[PDB]
């Protein structure tokens, strides 16, 4: 029996007309929906999923360079030029150097020097955008007691009709709540690891980055963040890569929480919805059975739940099944008027075998009352006291 | 008999003492020196020669070039530089050229261009300096009648003692006259030809030239006079030699007079000297002969010379030789009182054979007189009239 121990549980009742009922859904929460002559079905909102995230930025933390070259010129011979400076893939550096007779120049002065190297990224990390169009809410609806359907709902597709076997179907219509969802974070990935990071911090990471997804060939920006050029030779300049920066990010990610992405879809926790659900086509069993006639027995003694309700487990020692279960509460007993109400509304034992067990959940009135199971002389009762008031 | 028909003839007489006699010597002239009881010897100054001329300037009229190269630069790439521009042997040219995308530059602008070529001279012409130390005067002294010595005299060696066989020696002391010699000309040579040129015109010849003699390797100046640089492409420039210029000088040398240099010495015409000549050791034959006794005969009738003197040729039909010739002039003919004077002073017939001929030159007095040859009854006479007065 579901939603029994859920702390964040809600009880919604049905209108006089009997179609519109409003609910609000929390992740890690439940809503018990009761309506007049209706199966009393539980809605959960169990899973929030994101998928198909458009990539915003991709930062590189491990670089490599090749074909390094330099060009020099004596004073009064102009600026140095290598074919590679206008090439966007290469990172360059231009400076003046003291030239003279000792370096192969006919005079002593500052000469032009340029040095370039092709920058390639060996290992990159990726940031992805989390927008409403990427969301996927998995909501499970279950007959409180084939009889539990799961549905998935998009913000671009709010509706879904959950089908329950003999009970018809429930029609979910929802809309995304404003303020209780994410927009200020990105889905940072890093060598099959995954995190959630403040996108504001994300834009200020001192590493090379390109602005699109992996288009044609990525044009990296701020290549000097990993590549520095060592002081100054007269005709050369030495270029060095910093190497792997994975440890720097793993330590910059101190408080970040991890996620799980067993495929292309990313799992995480929270979620908040609001839903009008249509029960016009929800029915209790289209066949009216007779009552179970044999003796019942309390296996689990009545036990109070967090919300004031009580749960009872019986085992019906008869074969009449499928028969309705005679279950009510009574303050008179002589005889025999119902008080309170059942949560497991219209209990039915479909089991045709001998010693079928069944759990019930009753909503006792305040004060004293008797839980009554069975019909005839061999019926069972159990006192129950509930405290509090309106 | 020398100096007989010379138009520029001079007659110098002897002092009472008999050692010092002044003369002035013209090229193409003669000086007859008569002294008391002396051989009466003729000085000429026949030749003026120059030698060992220090070369002043050497011009080139035929050039050739090799290893031509160029260096270029796009705008903002500095000045062009080839190793051979600081090399003095090469002639270079530096200019700007329109550069652009069509010439292999990322810019449109004026680019530096230099072009150099090695200049070598195939054939040169030379100018030589004519200074007093280069002079050489050849003076010939001859007994008027072994008996003619030639002497050479330098301005750095003014003296020379001419040796005549039986007559002793004449001592020449001279000094170069001031103003009647050359200094404003050079000895221009050109492919074994030779000229005299005004050095002022020589310093303005538009051709390559070096300033010394052929030292180490000649450094030529004004190489652009033969080497012009034709129009300049973006990366190249064409260099061209004019070729031989010999005809240009042969036509610029319109009025120049040629010389002759059969060896390292160059002989030419003019010359002027002045000399004291010492006749203390000049003697008439140290033996006193007797008079010729046989008959004389006039072969050449007495003929007047340009200077009023007269010449007579006799043939002595006697064997007395060596005998002194009786020759005088007389106006009385009862007595043989000498009048005028002999120029062929103290004539001697050294010939011992039968019909020896001899030429005499007499200096007749003004008016009438008789040329008297011989001594005795068979002596010959010839009337002679000379016109003019003191």
């Amino acid at each position, epitope marked *: 029996i579901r939603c029994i121990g859920v702390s964040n549980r809600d009880f919604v009742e049905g209108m006089s007309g009997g179609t519109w009922v409003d609910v609000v859904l929390e992740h890690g929460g439940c809503v018990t929906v009761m309506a007049q002559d209706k199966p009393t079905v539980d809605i959960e909102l169990v899973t929030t999923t994101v998928s198909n995230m458009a990539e915003v930025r991709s930062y590189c933390y491990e670089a490599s360079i090749s074909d390094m070259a330099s060009d020099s010129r004596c004073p*009064t011979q102009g600026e140095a030029y290598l074919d590679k400076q206008s090439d966007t893939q290469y990172v360059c550096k231009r400076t003046l150097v003291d030239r003279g*007779w000792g370096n192969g120049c*006919g*005079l*002593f*002065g500052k000469g032009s020097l340029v040095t370039c190297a092709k920058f390639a990224c060996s290992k990159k990390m990726t940031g992805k955008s989390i927008q409403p169009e990427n969301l996927e809410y998995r909501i499970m609806l279950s007959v409180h007691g084939e009889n539990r359907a799961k549905v998935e709902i998009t913000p671009n597709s709010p509706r879904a009709e959950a089908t329950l076997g003999g009970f018809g179907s429930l029609g979910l219509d929802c809309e995304p709540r404003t303020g209780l969802d994410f927009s200020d974070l990105y889905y940072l990935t890093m060598n099959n690891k995954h995190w959630l990071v403040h996108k504001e911090w994300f834009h200020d990471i001192p590493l090379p980055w390109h602005a699109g997804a992996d288009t044609g060939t990525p044009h990296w920006n701020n290549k000097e963040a990993l590549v520095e050029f060592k002081d100054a030779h007269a005709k050369r300049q030495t270029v060095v890569v910093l190497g792997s920066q994975e440890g720097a990010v793993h330590t910059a990610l101190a408080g970040a929480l991890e996620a799980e992405m067993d495929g292309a879809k990313g799992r995480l926790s929270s979620g908040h919805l609001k839903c009008r659900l249509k029960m016009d086509k929800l029915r209790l069993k289209g066949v009216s059975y007779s009552l179970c006639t044999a003796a019942f027995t309390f296996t689990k003694i009545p036990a109070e739940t967090l919300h004031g309700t009580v749960t009872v487990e019986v085992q019906y020692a008869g074969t009449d099944g499928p028969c309705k279960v005679p279950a009510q509460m009574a303050v008179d007993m002589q005889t025999l008027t119902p008080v309170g109400r059942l949560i497991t509304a219209n209990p039915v034992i479909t089991e045709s075998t001998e010693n079928s067990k069944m759990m019930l959940e009753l909503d006792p009135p305040f004060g004293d009352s008797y839980i009554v199971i069975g019909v005839g002389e061999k019926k069972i009762t159990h006192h129950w006291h509930r405290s509090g008031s309106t | 008999i020398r100096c007989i028909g010379v138009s520029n003839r001079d007659f110098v007489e002897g002092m009472s003492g008999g050692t010092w006699v002044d003369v002035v010597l013209e090229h193409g002239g003669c000086v007859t020196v008569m002294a008391q009881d002396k051989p009466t010897v003729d000085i000429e100054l026949v030749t003026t020669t120059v030698s060992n001329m220090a070369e002043v300037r050497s011009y080139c009229y035929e050039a050739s070039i090799s290893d031509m190269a160029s260096d270029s630069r796009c705008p903002t790439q500095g000045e062009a530089y080839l190793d051979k521009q*600081s*090399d003095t042997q090469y002639v270079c040219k530096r200019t700007l050229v329109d550069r652009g995308w069509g010439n292999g530059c990322g810019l449109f602008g004026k680019g530096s261009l230099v072009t150099c070529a090695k200049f070598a001279c195939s054939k040169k012409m030379t100018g030589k300096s004519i200074q007093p130390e280069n002079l050489e005067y050849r003076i010939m002294l001859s007994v008027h009648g072994e008996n003619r010595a030639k002497v050479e005299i330098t301005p750095n060696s003014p003296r020379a003692e001419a040796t005549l066989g039986g007559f002793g020696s004449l001592g020449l002391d001279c000094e170069p006259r001031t103003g009647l010699d050359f200094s404003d000309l050079y000895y221009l040579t050109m492919n074994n030809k030779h000229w005299l040129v005004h050095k002022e015109w020589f310093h303005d010849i538009p051709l390559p030239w070096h300033a010394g003699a052929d030292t180490g390797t000649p450094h030529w100046n004004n190489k652009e006079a033969l080497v012009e640089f034709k129009d300049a492409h973006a990366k190249r420039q064409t260099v061209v030699v004019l070729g031989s210029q010999e005809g240009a000088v042969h036509t610029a040398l319109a009025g120049a007079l040629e010389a002759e240099m059969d060896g390292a010495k160059g002989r030419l015409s003019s010359g002027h000297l002045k000399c004291r000549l010492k006749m203390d050791k000049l003697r008439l034959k140290g033996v006193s002969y007797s008079l010729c006794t046989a008959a004389f005969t006039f072969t050449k009738i007495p003929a007047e010379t340009l200077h009023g003197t007269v010449t007579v040729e006799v043939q002595y039909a006697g064997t007395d030789g060596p005998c002194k010739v009786p020759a005088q002039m007389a106006v009385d003919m009862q007595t043989l009182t000498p009048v005028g004077r002999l120029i062929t002073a103290n004539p001697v017939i050294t010939e011992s054979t039968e019909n020896s001929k001899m030429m005499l030159e007499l200096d007749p007095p003004f008016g009438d007189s008789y040329i008297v040859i011989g001594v005795g009854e068979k002596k010959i006479t010839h009337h002679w009239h000379r016109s003019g007065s003191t």
Partner: antibody, heavy 118, light 108 residues
């Protein structure tokens, strides 16, 4: 304060070799920052550079005199030497030794007059 | 080689005047140019290097400016000891070469 002093003013015969020594005071010669040069001056009054040399020994000569010039260093005695050969009357001049601070001559010597005649 | 030119050649000024001397290189030497001072019977004295830097111990009167090919040495408030001929000097292609010199006489 570096001081430079060329060897005494001297007389040289034509076609013989001119030999000068300038000795450095007030500072080192085995230093990496400076060069060490020779500069002439004919009377009236042009300055001509002859050549410079490194304490290591590396020479740099004018192309107009390269074939006649030889410059040497003696780091142990803090001096350097100029040698011109095949001297003529055109080489009569005052010869200066100078410290070259890479592109300029920051310190000079008093100068030594060399006269060339027989 | 680069042949430097200097203007004017001679000039007579008077104490207190401001004198300007110009130097011209055929090729771009950007700022690698010097000015020297040579009094009679003495060695040159480096005044300016780098075409605008004053050398230590040189009076504030002297200054230099220029880039490329045309450089200018300026003498504020000329003094009677400033008698000298001034030379510009540049180095290029392992070759030192000096200017022709600007003689500066004093008028009083």
């Amino acid at each position: 304060q570096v001081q430079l002093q060329e060897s005494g003013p001297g007389l040289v015969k034509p076609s013989e070799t001119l030999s000068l020594i300038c000795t450095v005071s007030g500072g080192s010669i085995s230093t990496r920052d400076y060069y060490w040069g020779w500069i002439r001056q004919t009377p009236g009054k042009g300055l001509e550079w002859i050549g410079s040399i490194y304490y290591s020994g590396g020479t740099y000569y004018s192309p107009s005199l390269k074939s006649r010039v030889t410059i040497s260093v003696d780091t142990s005695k803090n001096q350097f030497s100029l040698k011109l050969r095949s001297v003529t009357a055109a080489d009569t001049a005052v010869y200066y030794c100078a410290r070259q601070w890479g592109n300029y001559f920051d310190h000079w010597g008093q100068g030594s007059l060399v006269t060339v005649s027989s | 080689d680069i042949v430097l030119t200097q203007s004017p050649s001679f000039l007579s000024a008077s104490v207190g005047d401001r004198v300007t001397i110009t130097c011209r290189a055929s090729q771009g030497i950007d700022t690698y140019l010097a000015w020297y001072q040579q009094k009679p019977g003495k060695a040159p004295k480096l005044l300016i290097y780098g075409a605008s830097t004053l050398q230590s111990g040189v009076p504030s009167r002297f200054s230099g400016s220029g880039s490329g090919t045309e450089f200018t040495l300026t003498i504020s408030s000329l003094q009677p000891e400033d008698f000298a001929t001034y030379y510009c000097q540049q180095l290029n292609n392992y070759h030192f070469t000096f200017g022709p010199g600007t003689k500066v006489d004093i008028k009083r």
